[PDB]
């Protein structure tokens, strides 16, 4: 029915939109961790400084697409509610 279908898509959209920013954030984390074990240095600001750029950057490039996804889903659900 039109409820379970609409409910599924809500969880599906979360995984899609947040996927790339969380993925890129994950990879960048491991790289700094590997580079640290290569040497005797120990620093905790280093991983944050590297990840900050990557997280903001990917959202910035993607911002144009997010509006396409949301503006179509909003119209879709409104029609089911009132059709």
């Amino acid at each position: 029915d039109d409820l379970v279908f609409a409910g599924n898509k809500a969880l599906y959209l979360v995984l899609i939109l947040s996927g790339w920013p969380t993925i890129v954030a994950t990879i960048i984390g491991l790289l700094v961790g590997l580079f640290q074990t290569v040497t005797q240095l120990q620093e905790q600001t280093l991983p944050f400084g590297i990840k900050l750029l990557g997280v903001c950057l990917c959202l910035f490039l993607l911002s144009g697409w997010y509006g396409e996804v949301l503006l179509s889903y909003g119209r879709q659900v409104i029609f089911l509610a009132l059709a």
Binding site: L3, L13, L17, P21, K51, Y73, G74, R75, V77
Partner: protein
Amino acid sequence: GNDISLIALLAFSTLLPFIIASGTCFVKFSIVFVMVRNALGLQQIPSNMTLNGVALLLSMFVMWPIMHDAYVYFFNDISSLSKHVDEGLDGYRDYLIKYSDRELVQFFENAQLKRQYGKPSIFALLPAYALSEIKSAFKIGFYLYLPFVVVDLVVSSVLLALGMMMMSPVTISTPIKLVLFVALDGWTLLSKGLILQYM
């Protein structure tokens, strides 16, 4: 007209606003707008004196055909008078039955027969209507909430990506909700869609 028509008209005008609250679409419209306000999280604004304002106006276009048909509609024996008066109300019964869920009318009819002995009348027909509009109003509220859930869950996840576990998403996700609503046709979509269900 007679002396007793005054007190019947006067007595009705005393109890008028309770029927309009419990047997008219105004109950549906009231909930829908409050459901929107909750989705945005703006429980101060707009005032109920505003939302209840737009709602009573819109309901006027829907119900008016039933009232005009009645006063223009308005004897040898009690059977002639009583059955004539009832024929006027039939113009209103048609409305309630069309919108009441069949299962509920059948339940309240049964419950009435069991006490008395062991077509529905207004008394039994009226409560079925109110519950029916509420159920349907709650369904509409869900689809309008459903698109904003995404914004909350996404913003919350992104914050943990950076490790900002102390930041409070509500302060950030509030403007995103408004932006989406303004980019859609907003209230113009609902108000049209709601009227078309009765027009």
